Amino acid sequence: KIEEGKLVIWINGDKGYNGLAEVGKKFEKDTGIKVTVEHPDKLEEKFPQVAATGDGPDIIFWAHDRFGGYAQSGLLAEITPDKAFQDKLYPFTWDAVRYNGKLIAYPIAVEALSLIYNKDLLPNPPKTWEEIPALDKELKAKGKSALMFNLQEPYFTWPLIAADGGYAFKYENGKYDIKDVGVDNAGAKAGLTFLVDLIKNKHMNADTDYSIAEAAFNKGETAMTINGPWAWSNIDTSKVNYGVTVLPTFKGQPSKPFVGVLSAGINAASPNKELAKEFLENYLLTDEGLEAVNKDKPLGAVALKSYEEELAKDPRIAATMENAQKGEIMPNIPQMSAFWYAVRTAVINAASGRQTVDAALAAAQTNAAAMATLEKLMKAFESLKSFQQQQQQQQQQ
Amino acid sequence: KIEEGKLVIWINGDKGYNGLAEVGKKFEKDTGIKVTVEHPDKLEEKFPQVAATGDGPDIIFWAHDRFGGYAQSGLLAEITPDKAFQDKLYPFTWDAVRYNGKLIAYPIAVEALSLIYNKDLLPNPPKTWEEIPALDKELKAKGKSALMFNLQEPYFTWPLIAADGGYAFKYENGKYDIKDVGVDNAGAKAGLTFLVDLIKNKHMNADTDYSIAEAAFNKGETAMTINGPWAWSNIDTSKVNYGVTVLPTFKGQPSKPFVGVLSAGINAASPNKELAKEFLENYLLTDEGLEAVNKDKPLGAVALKSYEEELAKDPRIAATMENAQKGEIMPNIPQMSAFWYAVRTAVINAASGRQTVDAALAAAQTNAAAMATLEKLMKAFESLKSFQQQQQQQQQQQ
Numbered sequence: 001k002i003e004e005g006k007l008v009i010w011i012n013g014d015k016g017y018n019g020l021a022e023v024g025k026k027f028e029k030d031t032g033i034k035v036t037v038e039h040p041d042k043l044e045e046k047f048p049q050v051a052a053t054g055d056g057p058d059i060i061f062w063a064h065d066r067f068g069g070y071a072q073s074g075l076l077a078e079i080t081p082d083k084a085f086q087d088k089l090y091p092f093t094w095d096a097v098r099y100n101g102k103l104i105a106y107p108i109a110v111e112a113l114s115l116i117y118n119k120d121l122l123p124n125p126p127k128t129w130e131e132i133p134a135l136d137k138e139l140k141a142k143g144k145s146a147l148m149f150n151l152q153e154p155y156f157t158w159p160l161i162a163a164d165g166g167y168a169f170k171y172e173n174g175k176y177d178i179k180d181v182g183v184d185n186a187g188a189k190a191g192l193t194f195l196v197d198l199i200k201n202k203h204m205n206a207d208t209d210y211s212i213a214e215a216a217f218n219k220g221e222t223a224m225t226i227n228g229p230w231a232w233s234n235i236d237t238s239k240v241n242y243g244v245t246v247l248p249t250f251k252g253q254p255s256k257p258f259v260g261v262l263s264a265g266i267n268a269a270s271p272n273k274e275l276a277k278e279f280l281e282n283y284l285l286t287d288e289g290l291e292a293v294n295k296d297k298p299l300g301a302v303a304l305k306s307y308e309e310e311l312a313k314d315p316r317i318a319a320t321m322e323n324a325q326k327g328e329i330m331p332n333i334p335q336m337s338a339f340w341y342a343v344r345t346a347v348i349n350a351a352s353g354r355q356t357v358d359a360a361l362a363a364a365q366t367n368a369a370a371m372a373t374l375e376k377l378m379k380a381f382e383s384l385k386s387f388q389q390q391q392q393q394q395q396q397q
Numbered sequence: 398k399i400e401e402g403k404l405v406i407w408i409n410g411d412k413g414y415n416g417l418a419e420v421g422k423k424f425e426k427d428t429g430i431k432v433t434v435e436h437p438d439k440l441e442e443k444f445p446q447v448a449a450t451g452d453g454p455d456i457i458f459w460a461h462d463r464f465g466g467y468a469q470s471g472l473l474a475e476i477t478p479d480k481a482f483q484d485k486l487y488p489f490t491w492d493a494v495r496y497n498g499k500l501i502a503y504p505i506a507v508e509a510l511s512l513i514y515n516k517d518l519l520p521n522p523p524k525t526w527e528e529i530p531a532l533d534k535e536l537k538a539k540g541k542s543a544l545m546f547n548l549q550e551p552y553f554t555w556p557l558i559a560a561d562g563g564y565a566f567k568y569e570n571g572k573y574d575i576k577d578v579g580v581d582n583a584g585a586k587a588g589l590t591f592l593v594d595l596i597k598n599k600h601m602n603a604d605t606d607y608s609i610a611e612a613a614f615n616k617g618e619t620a621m622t623i624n625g626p627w628a629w630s631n632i633d634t635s636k637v638n639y640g641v642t643v644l645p646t647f648k649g650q651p652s653k654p655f656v657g658v659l660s661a662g663i664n665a666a667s668p669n670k671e672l673a674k675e676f677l678e679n680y681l682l683t684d685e686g687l688e689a690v691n692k693d694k695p696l697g698a699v700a701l702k703s704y705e706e707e708l709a710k711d712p713r714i715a716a717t718m719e720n721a722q723k724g725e726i727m728p729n730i731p732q733m734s735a736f737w738y739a740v741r742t743a744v745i746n747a748a749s750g751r752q753t754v755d756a757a758l759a760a761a762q763t764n765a766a767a768m769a770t771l772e773k774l775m776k777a778f779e780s781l782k783s784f785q786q787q788q789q790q791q792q793q794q795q
C-alpha cells in the first residue's frame with residue numbers, strides 16, 4: 001500500500017520517461033530519497049483502479065481531460081503552491097487544472113493544432129479562413145489542391161466551428177456551466193455553414209480520413225494541412241519544406257482549437273506529498289527538469305513561461321503556443337464524452353446532405369442535453385452493480 | 398369513508414394503545430365525542446392505500462419521516478394552530494414537520510441516540526471523541542474494551558461523520574435543497590477518517606454489529622456504548638450500574654445524530670377535521686394527554702416544553718433531549734430513502750480498506766444521485782404499469 005520514504009512516478013512510455021529518471025538522480029543526490037518512473041501498458045486503467053483503493057504510484061502523468069474523472073472519483077490531494085509559483089507560468093494553463101474550483105495537478109506540457117504548409121508550393125500562407133477558396137481554384141487550376149485534413153473526425157472540425165461564438169459549455173468563473181452549451185448559436189451557424197459552402201463549392205472533400213490528411217500533404221499535394229506535433233516526425237520522413245504557423249482568422253475571429261495539457265497530479269493516499277512538493281516544484285520544472293524531458297522526447301509548448309520562451313525560437317513551436325492563447329481548454333468534465341458523439345454525428349450530416357447546418361447543430365445541442373440522461377442512466381447501472389456485487393458476495397454464503 | 402361526527406385513530410404495538418383510552422374517555426366526557434383507537438400492523442402500507450380512497454383513520458401517529466411520502470401524496474391536512482400554541486413546544490420540532498413550507502403534523506415524541514456507560518468501570522465518562530482512543534489503551538490494560546457499538550449501519554455511524562459539518566441535504570427557509578448534499582466536504586472527510594483510525598488502531602473491529610455490541614455491554618465487557626430508548630429494558634435486565642449522557646464532541650464541535658419525532662397528522666378526507674385539532678390542542682397536549690401515555694408506554698422525550706421540563710429530572714432523558722436539540726433533524730423527502738444505501742456502502746468500504754475515505758465519499762454522490770433518479774424511474778414506470786389496469790377495465794373487460 002503506497003510507498004512511505006521513497007517516490008514512485010508514472011508516465012506513458014511514449015512521453016520522455018528518461019527526463020524523470022534523471023530528475024530522479026537530481027532528487028536522489030539532493031535530499032537522499034529514491035525516485036523511479038514506471039510506463040505500464042495503458043496506466044489509464046491501472047491508476048484509478050488501484051488508486052481508488054490506495055496504492056498505485058505517488059504521482060501521475062497524463063493529459064488533463066482524464067484527470068477530471070480521477071478527481072471526480074477523488075484521487076488527487078489538491079496541490080498548494082504560492083502566488084510565486086502560480087505566477088512562474090501562464091495564467092490560462094491554470095484554468096486547465098480546476099475541479100469544483102480547486103487545484104489538483106501540476107501542468108506540464110501543452111498540445112494544440114497548427115497550420116502546416118509547403119513553402120515550395122505556398123508563400124506567406126493565408127491569415128483568414130476566407131482566403132482559401134480564392135487559393136484553391138488558383139492552385140487546383142495547376143492540378144493541385146488548396147487544403148486538406150480529417151473531415152471524418154470532429155476534434156479536427158471544431159477550430160472553425162468555435163471560431164465564431166460556438167463553444168462547448170461556458171465555464172463562467174472557474175467552474176463549468178452544464179446548461180450553457182453554446183453550439184447552436186450565432187457562431188456555430190456561420191461557422192459550420194462556411195464548411196458546407198466549401199464542400200459544395202468542391203474545395204473540400206468529405207470521405208477525407210486522417211491518412212488522407214497526412215498522406216496527401218506528404219506527397220506535395222494539398223499545400224495546407226492542419227494537425228498537431230505528433231506528425232512533425234513524419235514530415236522529415238517525407239522531407240517536404242514546411243511549415244507550421246497560426247491558424248487563419250474566420251470573421252476576423254481567431255480559429256478556436258482545443259488544448260490538451262499534460263501535467264501531473266498526486267494520489268491522495270500517497271503519504272509523501274511533501275516529497276512530491278519540492279520535487280515537482282523546483283526540480284521537475286525550472287528549465288533543467290523540463291529540458292531533460294523534452295530532450296529524450298519533445299513536449300512541444302511547455303507550461304513554464306521562461307522555458308517555452310527559450311525554445312520558442314522554433315517557428316513551429318511558437319505557432320502551436322499561439323494557438324493555445326486563442327484556444328479552448330479541453331473540459332475535463334465527463335460531459336465531454338457525449339459532446340464528442342453528438343457533434344461527431346452532427347458533422348457527418350452537416351455536409352452529407354442527409355441533414356442541414358442549422359438543423360444539425362440544433363439537433364446536436366438538443367441531443368447533447370439529452371445525453372446527460374444516458375449518463376445519469378449509465379451511472380445508475382454502475383450503482384446497481386456496486387450493490388448487486390455485495391449481494392453476489394452474500395450469495396456465496 | 399373515514400367517520401363523520403367521531404374520531405378513529407391508529408398507532409402501533411410499541412405505543413401503548415390504552416394510553417389514549419384515557420384521552421379518548423376524557424374527550425368523550427367533556428364534549429361527548431366518541432374516540433376509538435386501533436392497533437393494526439402494516440399501518441405504513443394499508444394506510445396510504447385506504448387514505449387514497451378517502452378511507453382510513455381521521456388521525457395517525459408515526460415518526461415524521463414516513464410522513465414525507467404521505468405529505469407529498471397529499472394525504473395530510475394542513476394543520477393550523479397558533480404561534481401562541483407553537484411556543485408550548487420546542488421550535489425545532491417544528492422544523493421537522495413541513496412539506497414545502499406548509500405545516501402537516503402535530504409533534505409528539507423525540508428519539509435520538511445517547512451515550513451509555515458503566516459507572517463501575519468508568520464513573521465519570523470521557524465526552525470527547527479524540528480522548529476515546531487513549532481510554533481503550535487504559536481499559537484494554539485490565540481487559541474490557543473502551544467502546545463497542547454498531548458499525549454496520551449508518552444511523553449508528555453517521556453521528557460522528559456529521560460531526561465536523563457533514564450533512565445529507567441543506568435546510569434553511571423551511572425546505573431541503575435536493576442538490577446541496579454535504580457528504581463530501583472536510584467534515585465528512587475528517588468524520589469517516591477519524592473512525593477508521595479506531596479500527597486501524599485495534600480499538601474495535603469492523604465485524605461488530607448491533608447484537609454483538611449490545612451483548613458485550615450487557616455483560617460489562619465494554620465501558621461505553623451508543624443506542625436509543627429501545628435498550629433501557631435490556632440493560633435494567635442486566636442490572637448494570639449505567640448512565641446516559643450527551644455524546645462526545647469532535648474538534649470541539651458537538652457530534653449530532655438523526656432525530657425521530659413521533660407525530661400526528663390528519664387525513665385530507667377526514668370529515669371530522671374540527672374535532673381532531675380540538676382533541677389534540679387541549680385534550681391530548683397538556684401534562685395529562687402526555688402523562689396518560691407515559692404510564693402506559695414510556696415515550697422517552699416529548700416536544701411539549703411544559704411536560705418535557707417535568708420528566709427531565711430523569712437524567713436518561715435530559716441527555717437524549719440535549720442530543721436532539723444539538724441534532725440534525727432527519728428529513729422526510731424520498732431521496733433520504735436513497736441516502737441509506739449510498740452511505741452504508743461508503744462506511745463498510747472504508748471499514749475494510751476496500752477503498753479510501755476520499756474515494757468512498759465523493760463516489761457516494763454518484764450512488765446518491767443514481768438512486769434519486771432511478772427512484773424517479775420506479776415511481777414513473779409505476780404509472781404506465783398500474784395504469785395498464787384502468788387502461789383495460791375501462792377499455793372493455795370482455
Ligand SMILES: [Ca+2]
Ligand atoms: Ca474511431
Ligand SMILES: [Ca+2]
Binds near residue numbers: 184
Ligand atoms: Ca443558446
Ligand SMILES: [Ca+2]
Binds near residue numbers: 209
Ligand atoms: Ca480508419
Ligand SMILES: [Ca+2]
Binds near residue numbers: 668
Ligand atoms: Ca360537517
Ligand SMILES: [Ca+2]
Binds near residue numbers: 715716
Ligand atoms: Ca436538554
Ligand SMILES: [Ca+2]
Binds near residue numbers: 779
Ligand atoms: Ca413495485
Ligand SMILES: [Zn+2]
Binds near residue numbers: 013039040041
Ligand atoms: Zn511500456
Ligand SMILES: [Zn+2]
Binds near residue numbers: 133
Ligand atoms: Zn471558390
Ligand SMILES: [Zn+2]
Binds near residue numbers: 310
Ligand atoms: Zn538556456
Ligand SMILES: [Zn+2]
Binds near residue numbers: 410436438
Ligand atoms: Zn397489534
Ligand SMILES: [Zn+2]
Binds near residue numbers: 598
Ligand atoms: Zn493511537
